[PDB]
From a paper:
Here, we report the characterisation of the structures WzcK540M2YE (Y718E, Y717E), WzcK540M3YE (Y718E, Y717E and Y715E) and WzcK540M3YE_N711Y (an additional N711Y mutation) corresponding to different phosphorylation states. One intermediate, 2pY which has Y713 at the active site, does not follow the YxY pattern, since position 711 is asparagine. We show that it is binding of the i-2 tyrosine to the tyrosine pocket (where i is the number of the residue positioned at the kinase active site) orders the tail between the tyrosine at the active site and helix α23. A mutant of 2pY (Wzc3YE_N711Y) stabilises the C-terminal tail was functional in vivo, restoring immunoreactive CPS to levels approximating the wild type. This is consistent with a model in which the more stable the Wzc octamer the higher the Wzy activity. We note the reduction of CPS production by destabilising D28A and K701A mutants further support this model. The Wzc3YE_N711Y shows greater phosphorylation relative to Wzc3YE and proteomic analysis of purified WzcYF_713Y/N711Y reveals both N711Y and Y713 are phosphorylated. We propose that the YxY pattern serves as a molecular ratchet, that by selecting a tyrosine over phosphotyrosine, ensures phosphorylations in unidirectional (moving from the C to the N).
Wzc, an integral cytoplasmic membrane tyrosine autokinase protein serves as the master regulator of the biosynthesis and export of many bacterial capsular polysaccharides and exopolysaccharides. Wzc regulates polymerisation functions through cycling the formation and dissociation of an octameric complex, driven by changes in the phosphorylation status of the tyrosine-rich tail.
Residue numbers in the entry:
A (entry chain H), B (entry chain A), C (entry chain B): 17 to 64, 85 to 261, 409 to 477, 494 to 714
């Protein structure tokens, strides 16, 4: 491989690359803007050692004392239903509410799993509130204590707007101690001095400084039954989430996944990409037809279409190839369905009719031929009725209205399509038509699916295959050619159909307007 | 690859290389001259240890004491609207102003984000000044204190020119302490001695020395409730920005980006560069025409042009190639539009007419032919009107004025250009003209876009393709030749057009004046 | 590559190699002889530790005390206008002057940048002197103090010759301390003993020893409020610049730059170097003509020239090649101008005329032919006038005086040179001349520039190309041959012209005298 190939591949897949990278970067931005910020407070302690003091600070006696002093076993969480409600509320500038609770005693359900009882408190005004544990609604008032239904609560100084809801949990003392220990750090910072740096993290910048001051006071008071050089203050800039590294990670991750996905698609492609793939195998390509982005004949509705220009190129190529052919019959076939055989056949018939030659178009697709719909029809008396013997050769020929050539439709779909085509009446029809017309074009079903084209091809002096631009593979076309050669039918060459513009190709068609 | 190639590439791209390097170096110089200089002061302290003293110096008690003593919570910034105003003002030799403020109390808005209140003070004279916080204009006088609108201010010794504006911020004490700590360093410098080196950086060389003296005095006074060997002095040479390394980095960065960009363009080029690329594929090149930097025929306006000399070379080559041709008709075509087919065709007709031969020029580009504009025209009765049957072969031929040959214009643009050219009247016209002229030159549309040239080429004894020097690729020309061969038209060879001088080429044309 | 090639390349480029190396070595010698010498003094101190004493010696208290004692803030510099004046003065044996100044007070301008005031003192005699700060001229006398114009000066013991000028600077105390600190070093030299080695460098060998003695005394005196084992003495041999390493570096740098430059030129050469380069491509070389270092014909002025000998070799080669040629016409052409086509053509005509054969020389360079100047002329009625029809074939032929052959000049420069040559009168002239002469030689313009030679070559039975020895490339000659072949002109072979002696060649011509 070379760099031009990969650059063209990136240019072609730019829509997917951009979409994937933008999606990943949007998710990264949403996380870096909706994650709750985490602040850090710290304090500095003087030791007159300092290895066992580190274990004494993190022990459950000191931390438990702090928790008892500060009532850290009463967890209060402002309620937002979604997982992004809190982040949005912070972004909108809404001030978070808080409640001071000095006494809480839940009935302590203490079942197998839920060791932490919790209730929901809804604020009705600055004074009263509603409480529900499991649907049991009670009304309480700030100030006066509540002792009802096995529930004790004392609420002071509700500072929020009415309608807010708060989850109040009474978690066990060990759970509180473990929570405090997880966010608490002690370090020496000199490895030999009596200086210890205590650190604490949390989402409330005032609460963490109060908690660290409590820890320092408890440790100092316990030791004298040590000097606090720096009492706890909180850095106002949150330490998490780290926004810029998150966004950079998101962008780079999006780019790498996009690149590997494009590499995956490029390594898994097998369709035809240029006429050179067919010409390596030894197959003549007579034209490349682009997709016309424009029940009508294209060569009649839009004669100045680019696909019709490419078909005029095919017309001039054929006028030279079909010299020294045994008769004036051309058969168009292909490997797979919807490659474009009917499109090519009918539009070629129209462009050859505009030059003043008499053209007969035969729809010999007895299984799915729709040419009568595309030309305007009297669907009676098609090729079926003629072959089965219930029609004559003069009742089946009709005129294309905006075209200028004659045609024969398929007729009624028969039960034995391949066997009807083997009747000698088919060759009688071809020999009769070959004397009243300058050209006969026969449209057929694909050869890999059924065998009708190989029957028809015995009486055609020229045979061309239609290959679809991206769908078909080189192996398919080669197998189709060999299946034709085995039945005694020589295939003159190929027509590539439905070509589109690709930056990776480096093959230049003339698929652009000139005028 | 070899070194001659890369040297030629650099010579060719020197304009881009020089421009990019000069832009990057100019940006580096602008930064190294507009960045505010940062000075450094330092002091030396004697310790009679020295590991915990390092943590005691950087603690908030000592630094906070210094900040309280020196009023470092009053931030004063001289106001320049742009981000380069201060640098320009320093470069112009303008002396920065300063104000001594001993008492500041802003109303402490203290909203969600802006924790630092700030006002703007405009100097009206040496005595009075104007103050605005949020549009509230007040007048104050140096000396007498101001207590108005919840704002307290005391300003002493305004030393600036009238019209200056200063931002006065009252930042919080922790913010001041963090600012001081960021620019403050303590080191041991012997790792065992009682010597400590204290360092401080900042943009004011006197303020930083005062701050470091205050820190040293506070630490010394606190310890005795230590010897200061060296009091703080400031190195007069700024430590940042480091100009020479910045400029060197800018130059080297410019060179590397230029080299990679030129390498990128060289690896992405696919156009034809020399006739050897076409001759490898097996295509005869009959001439290489340079760009003529000079609605007129070039071979008539400037007969001594270099392009006309190259076209005389083509004339002598053709006089030998067109021997043993079936008729005296030459068709010029090409792959893509604006390769130079009309330019070559018409100028070749002029140079062959000056040698005394009778020449007919036919503009068979029925879609975009403009030869009638370039020759001086009676636009009626062109090739269209003749082919469609509404004109005779004697009414369509006209004389080029400054030329010396006959011509046929396209006529009115028809709706069916390819089908008009297929009329037997075209061959009748060619056979009639072939007996009254020594040479007929036919100009055509490009073959990749439309098929008209392949129709015309059946009656031309000689056919040449025009390839544009840098635009076309070898694949394009090969595809054009094969599309012609498929239609039964043998292409004699190619003409390379619009060649220019490239140091990387190492192919020598004769594109220079001799006279 | 092999060693013989590179040795020959060095032999050929020896002039450049020697010049570059000599230039670099001369610059190195000039630096190593003009750089001011820097002396070193040192002293040895005993410590009864020694880690903090190192920081105490380099502190600003001790160094500042030394500077105050020795008045090191008075900088005196003897004035030389150029940057090599001092070095030359030292080399000429001139004794540097000195002035003892005990009191200096400049007005202390103290602007934004120039913190160091300076004045210029011009010595008028042993007693009086002139002083100028900014053009303000004052007269002072040794002894009596000066207090004028805000300037205080006391000068003692002027020891210099009259006319000398000295810059006297009053630099700030910190600048003096930093200057002293930069040149001062302290080391332990045992890493554990009480021995310290103090070192000081400077351009004055007595001043530095005095300064180091002052530093030692101040440190010793301060400590007792330490033993000086060795007081300061100066090594009389300067420590910088180190001459031999500088000169060796200069020589080696010159050699490496010379070698890379010669390698650069050798890798960038593309011209023809030997006839073998042309014979690989399949081109017969019939002669190699050397440069003749000798408006005259060389074969007449200096018949025993080496170039004329090589041309006699060409004459004998041609007498055998031109057998079985269709006529007796020889055309000489070439690729590029000033390859030597006229030189070869005319001198070949002279050497063939001395053998008793009748020779006609035709100057068919209608664009820049100067043969009439070189033969002695009647410039009227040349080839132009004949072709345009205004002269006959008998009025245009003239005699070369010192030669022995006939010639036709170009005539008046025409506006249509290529079209004049296409007249059938040219072939009439050639057919008439072919019956009255044994040989006709035609000189032409180069074929890459214009096409005239390809027109003339149709009527020449033999055609030779001239290639210039170093200017032309193999690609040029091959392109010229192919441009001739395309026009139906067969080129017999080549003549290499202007060959010179190259040690790298290893191709031996016979370009030496034999006689
Ligand atoms: N180059 C093309 N541009 C636009 N439409 C095309 C092109 N080729 C085929 N088609 C359309 O795509 C559809 C499938 O092609 P069709 O010719 O009917 O398939 P089949 O090979 O089975 O006979 C048709 O509706 C056809 O009109
Ligand atoms: N070697 C050239 N030097 C200067 N101008 C040129 C050269 N070749 C083409 N042109 C000019 O560039 C324009 C486009 O070329 P043209 O011959 O008209 O294109 P086309 O190939 O479509 O017929 C024209 O205006 C032409 O005169
Ligand atoms: N081998 C040579 N030795 C000395 N002078 C030479 C040699 N070859 C050419 N010259 C001189 O160098 C100049 C340029 O060569 P000239 O023959 O006039 O060039 P051109 O190829 O254009 O006809 C002339 O003055 C010529 O006399
Ligand atoms: Mg179909
Ligand atoms: Mg054109
Ligand atoms: Mg000459």
């Amino acid at each position: 491989i070379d760099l031009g190939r990969v650059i063209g591949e990136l240019i072609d897949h730019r829509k997917l690359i951009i979409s994937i990278t933008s999606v990943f970067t949007l998710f990264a931005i949403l996380y870096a803007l909706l994650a709750t910020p985490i602040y850090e407070t710290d304090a500095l302690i003087q030791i007159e050692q300092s290895a066992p003091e580190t274990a004494l600070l993190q022990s459950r006696m000191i931390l438990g004392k702090t928790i008892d002093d500060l009532n850290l076993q009463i967890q209060i969480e402002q309620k937002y239903f979604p997982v992004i409600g809190r982040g949005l509320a912070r972004l909108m500038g809404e001030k978070p509410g808080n409640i001071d609770i000095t006494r809480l005693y839940l009935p302590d359900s203490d079942d197998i799993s839920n060791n932490t009882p919790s209730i929901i408190l809804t604020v009705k005004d600055k004074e009263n509130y509603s409480i529900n544990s499991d649907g049991i609604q009670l009304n309480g008032v700030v100030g006066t204590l509540l002792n009802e239904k096995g529930i004790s609560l004392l609420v002071n100084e509700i500072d929020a707007k009415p309608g807010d809801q708060f989850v109040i949990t009474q978690l066990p003392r060990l759970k509180a101690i473990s929570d405090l220990l997880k966010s608490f750090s002690v370090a020496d910072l000199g490895k030999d001095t009596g200086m210890l740096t205590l650190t604490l993290t949390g989402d409330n910048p005032k609460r963490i400084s109060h908690i660290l001051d409590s820890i320092s006071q408890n440790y100092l008071a316990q030791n004298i039954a040590v000097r606090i050089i720096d009492n706890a203050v909180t850095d106002p800039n949150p330490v998490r989430p780290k926004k810029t590294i998150i966004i950079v990670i998101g962008v780079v991750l999006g780019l790498i996944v996009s690149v590997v996905l494009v590499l995956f698609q490029v390594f898994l492609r097998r369709g035809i990409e240029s006429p050179e793939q067919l010409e390596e195998i030894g197959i003549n390509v007579y034209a490349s037809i682009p997709i016309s982005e424009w029940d009508t004949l294209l060569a009649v509705g839009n004669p100045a279409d680019l696909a019709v220009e490419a078909i005029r190129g095919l017309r001039t190529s054929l006028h030279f190839a079909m010299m020294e052919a045994k008769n004036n019959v051309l058969m168009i076939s292909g490997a797979s369905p919807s490659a474009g055989m009917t499109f090519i056949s009918s539009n070629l018939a129209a462009t050859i009719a505009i030059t003043g030659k008499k053209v007969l178009f035969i729809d010999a697709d007895l299984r799915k031929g729709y040419a009568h719909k595309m030309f305007g029809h009297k669907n009676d008396k098609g090729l079926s009725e003629f072959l089965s013997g219930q029609a004559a050769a003069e009742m089946i020929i009709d005129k294309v209205e905006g075209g200028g050539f004659d045609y024969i439709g398929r007729g009624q779909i028969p039960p034995n399509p391949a066997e009807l085509l083997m009747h000698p009446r088919f060759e009688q029809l071809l020999n009769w038509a070959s004397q009243n017309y300058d050209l006969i074009i026969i449209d057929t079903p694909p050869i890999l699916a059924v065998t009708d084209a190989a029957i028809i091809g015995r009486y055609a002096g020229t045979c061309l295959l239609v290959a679809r631009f991206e769908k078909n593979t080189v192996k398919e076309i080669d197998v189709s050619m060999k299946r034709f050669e085995q039945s005694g039918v020589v295939v003159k060459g190929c027509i590539l159909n439905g070509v589109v513009k690709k930056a990776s190709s480096y093959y230049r068609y003339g698929h652009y307007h000139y005028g």
